[PDB]
Amino acid sequence: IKQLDDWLKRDRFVFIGWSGLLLFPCSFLAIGAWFTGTTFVTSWYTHGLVSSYLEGCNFLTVAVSTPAESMGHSLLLLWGPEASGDFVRWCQIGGLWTFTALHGVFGLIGFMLRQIEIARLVGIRPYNAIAFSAPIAVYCATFLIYPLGQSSWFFGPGFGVSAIFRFLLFFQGFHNYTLNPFHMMGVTGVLGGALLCAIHGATVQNTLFRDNQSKNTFKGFSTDQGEETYSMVTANRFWSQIFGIAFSNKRWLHFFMLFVPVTGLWMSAIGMAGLAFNLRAYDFVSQEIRAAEDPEFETFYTKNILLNEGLRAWLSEMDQPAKKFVFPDEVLPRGF
Amino acid sequence: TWDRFCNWVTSTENRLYIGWFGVLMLPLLGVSITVFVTAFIAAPPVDIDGIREPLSGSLLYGNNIITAAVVPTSNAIGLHFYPIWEAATLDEWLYNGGPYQMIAFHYIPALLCYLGREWELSYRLGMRPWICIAYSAPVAATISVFLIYPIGQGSFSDGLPMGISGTFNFMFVFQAEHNILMHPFHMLGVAGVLGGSLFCAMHGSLVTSSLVNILAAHGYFGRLIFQFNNSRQLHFFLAAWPVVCIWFVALGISTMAFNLNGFNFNHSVLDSQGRVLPSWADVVNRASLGFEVMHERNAHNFP
Amino acid sequence: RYWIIHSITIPALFIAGWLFVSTGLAYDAFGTPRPNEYYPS
């Protein structure tokens, strides 16, 4: 009871801790399932698609694809009634997706618990765990909350490069997710987060203190110090004169580097949670009616609506094989 | 007295540094801000496609700020230099998307002067000079979509529209033409902004959580992963990763201007008989086909 | 001592991976269709 706690809490090459009993098997299983699915397992019976290296796919097109639409929101447990212990049936119905998705959440939970456990042991504030709540919010919203709100696990994101690319394009045509204001705040968070990474790193590097005489500064007896490696005063003077404003306090700037991408991801998680209920934003019916009453009238908004229509019709026969949509060539949209 | 002007312009004592790049910047910014704001509010519709079907981009012609854009120069102009004086009339200039070419041709040099101004102040402040290197990544990115991609495609109508919905329209049309998602340089660009956000949140969280001490900040991070520790190397990597990746994605847009497109794995997996077995790339290709057919105004390879 | 049981069992696991696919056992174990089995003719 405290015997195993000492062995968990020890000084080795990788820390385990109590959180490691959740993180390490679940992450290994989630990653192991993804490798298993992308190497050997087909998506022919769930999507009519070929999706492993055994099929002839490459890294860009392998996926652990979502379960078949017939499976609904079943957990698709290996011993559950859908597979009944048959591993061949289980892989064919998409049981590896639910395996990867559900083991992914528990590793992600186990990871953030590990952040808390180490911060508690070392004795520092657990802001890294707070910041990791945003990748967890994005994952839960996109991989769990969205398919659960939808008709089946089928409409979730597949665990693959191109499956994700399909997921991106599906959200344009069917959800107009670019116009979603929460996705907009997400993009601002991520580009702003990337901007902060580049400016701050360049600002530190280019306001470094001269300590040694080597022409490479990655060893000027100041890297061990930490931040005090660079001139806060000269950096503030540069940015107050180039940009107008500068982050004068090192604590606030690093608070802002925390806050900007984390809040952005949390915003995108709210937008995604809304789309679980098909709650898409921004009708702008004035432009739609005007372009339905005046052929001379066109905006970029009404052009995008036509693009999304083209997306929906041209994708969904292939993208939803269980529905067995038949769109004759004449019903398909075009600008021809 | 000329030296007095030289002394004030290069002075590091003003509220904002002007410098020599900045005397070649505030005119260019003066024009490009003024024309953008006026065109965003009040420009008449622009016949972007050149086939007399005008596109309304401005606030006073039916748009809100989300849907409004300065509409790119007409396809009829192509890459022609279209200054305000070479139009027949003022209305013909506005009809053929004159303001966009005015904005883009002042905004792009102004950013290049902002680049040199950032160098110039860092030189006068005794700083190392490479913050401007970092800023060259969004500059190259915006030049690729506003300048290089129109040049490669042969028309400024293919440039990025100066608006929120026009930008989205540009994304989808580009995917249809070029399959930017399967372009590895765009793949690098995504890793650059998502990872750049990751490193930003991580560095922000790690530093702020050790305020009261890097010895407990590296006792933390050394324990969370396997056991830098060099603040110089870490901060170089924080700059380098978003910057290098954004350079590649800017080069991706630029090389796709020449139609060096993303990977095409359409019809790439075959059965024993030779039937195409669809993959996820073929599903993406069908989706991007849906964008392509609405944007096309006559296709010549589709019933 | 160390490098004896690695010269034996590292190519042994690579061969077993190779024999998993080359003898077609990977298809049966996962239900992956063979190239002539996607379209039942």
Binding site: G56 | - | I10, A26
Partner: peptide, 30 residues
């Protein structure tokens, strides 16, 4: 026999089995 042996051999034993199969898929005729 603790974590160090089990961590390396849970992540390299399948990783060379898988790399053995992925090497074998390159010589598949279809």
């Amino acid at each position: 026999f603790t974590i160090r042996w089990l961590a390396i051999h849970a992540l390299a034993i399948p990783s060379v089995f898988f790399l053995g199969s992925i090497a074998a898929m390159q010589f598949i005729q279809r």
